[PDB]
Amino acid sequence: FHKIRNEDLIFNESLGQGTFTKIFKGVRREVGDYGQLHETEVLLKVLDKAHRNYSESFFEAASMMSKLSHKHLVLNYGVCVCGDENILVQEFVKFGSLDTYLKKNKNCINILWKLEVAKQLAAAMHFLEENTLIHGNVCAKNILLIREEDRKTGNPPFIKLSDPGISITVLPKDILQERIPWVPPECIENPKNLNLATDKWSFGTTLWEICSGGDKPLSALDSQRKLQFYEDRHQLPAPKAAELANLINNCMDYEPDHRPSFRAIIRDLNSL
Ligand SMILES: NC(=O)Nc1sc(-c2ccccc2)cc1C(N)=O
């Protein structure tokens, strides 16, 4: 990672929290192309000092997103490790994360919007699958809306996939259980089972989010009941707008080897 000096970063408003992290809008002072000075809006992701022992996994998550370059993958600008800080500096996305956007805009998001976003997410995941690169935490909170839909210009929405955060392979078991049904059953059984098939299951859960207007699947179940949901081999209920429910369930296959390739997922989406 490129090293960014603390003196070149300004922290502004809080944008929320992730697992052992706090996120802020900020400004980065930098020399850009042609030697021009810029004050660039950035996303500042800060690892909690209490959890500094996760720094390796924290940065490895972002390293994963920068191994490859792709129009649907969030840009990392660098890191700031001055003083006692562990900070990831990323591109700032004006419209924020997709979970919040879905909850706030539930009434004006139709089937075609959901289908377009699903196709773009599947394109990003196909690129990762072709590169045999595991993401490990696909969810609407890790999808960023770059551009809103604009029917006046026919322009679709445009999304990017953000980094997965600290890996489920090192997180405490209680956090993994609270992350059911994004974390697949085989990873509840053994977090070292993390594999490309993991991301197919979590993609299914994320499509359910996209189709459910901000709702979180199984939110009414406490951790013990989420575990039993997997033990009883249940599937999620179909979203009220159920156009993608069969795809969701085919992706959330309890047999990892039976989950469809992202090429097949894309073909299915294109058939609708
Ligand atoms: N890369 C990036 O910008 N990530 C962003 S921006 C954002 C946001 C923006 C405006 C109002 C409220 C929240 C949230 C998050 C996130 N969860 O990552």
What DSSP line would sit under 212-231, residue for residue? TTTPPTTTTS-HHHHHHHHH
Same domain for 270 and 163: yes
Domain at 16, CATH number? 3.30.200.20
Residues 6+ apart with CB under 8 A from 62: 1, 76, 79, 88, 90, 163
Contacts 24+ apart (CB under 8 A), 22-28: 22/46, 22/48, 25/92, 26/89, 28/4, 28/77, 28/89
Same domain for 99 and 66: no
DSSP 179: T
Write out the residue range of the structural domain in which residue 243 sits.
Answer: 93-272
Picking from 58, 77, 92, the residue at the C-terminal end of a domain is: 92
Q: Is the CB of 86 under 6 A from ligand 1?
A: no
Same domain for 10 and 82: yes
CA of 97 to the centre of ligand 1 (A): 6
**Plot region of 36 (φ>0 → left; ψ -120 to 50 → alpha; else → beta):** beta
Six-digit token string for 90: 């990323």
Please choose, from the candidates 145, 166, 167, the residue with its C-alpha nearest in 3D space to the C-alpha of residue 157: 145
Same domain for 208 and 100: yes
Picking from 92, 108, 130, the residue at the C-terminal end of a domain is: 92
Is the CB of residue 176 less than 8 Å from the CB of residue 187?
yes
Q: Is the CB of 73 under 6 A from ligand 1?
A: no
Same domain for 160 and 103: yes
Angstrom CA distances, 239 to 110, 134, 139, 193, stand at 13, 27, 16, 29
Name the closest-CA residue to atom 17, ligand 1. 97
Q: Taking the CB of residue 58, how many other CB atoms lie within 10 A of it?
A: 29
Same domain for 75 and 7: yes
- Note if the bond before 239 is cis, omega within 30 degrees: no
CA of 71 to the centre of ligand 1 (A): 18
Is the CB of residue 79 less than 8 Å from the CB of residue 87?
yes
Domain at 247, CATH number? 1.10.510.10
The DSSP bridge pattern shows strands 87-91 and 76-80 to be antiparallel
Which of 105, 144, 158, 159 for mutating ligand 1's site (highest number of atoms within 8 Å of CB)? 144
Same domain for 104 and 41: no
Element (H, E) at 27: strand 21-31
Same domain for 150 and 203: yes
Is the CB of residue 221 less than 8 Å from the CB of residue 237?
no
Q: How far is CA 213 from the centre of its chain?
A: 17
Stated in angstroms to one decimal place, the resolution of this structure is: 1.5
Q: Is the CB of 167 under 6 A from ligand 1?
A: no
* CA 57/CA 79 separation, integer angstroms: 14
Counting the structural domains of the chain, the total is: 2
Same domain for 170 and 43: no
Same domain for 137 and 34: no
Name the closest-CA residue to atom 1, ligand 1. 92
Q: Coil, strand, or helix at residue 162? A: coil
* Experimental method of this PDB entry: X-ray
Is the CB of residue 86 less than 8 Å from the CB of residue 52?
yes
Same domain for 33 and 104: no
CA of 45 to the centre of ligand 1 (A): 10
Picking from 92, 115, 135, the residue at the C-terminal end of a domain is: 92
Same domain for 1 and 126: no
CA of 198 to the centre of ligand 1 (A): 25
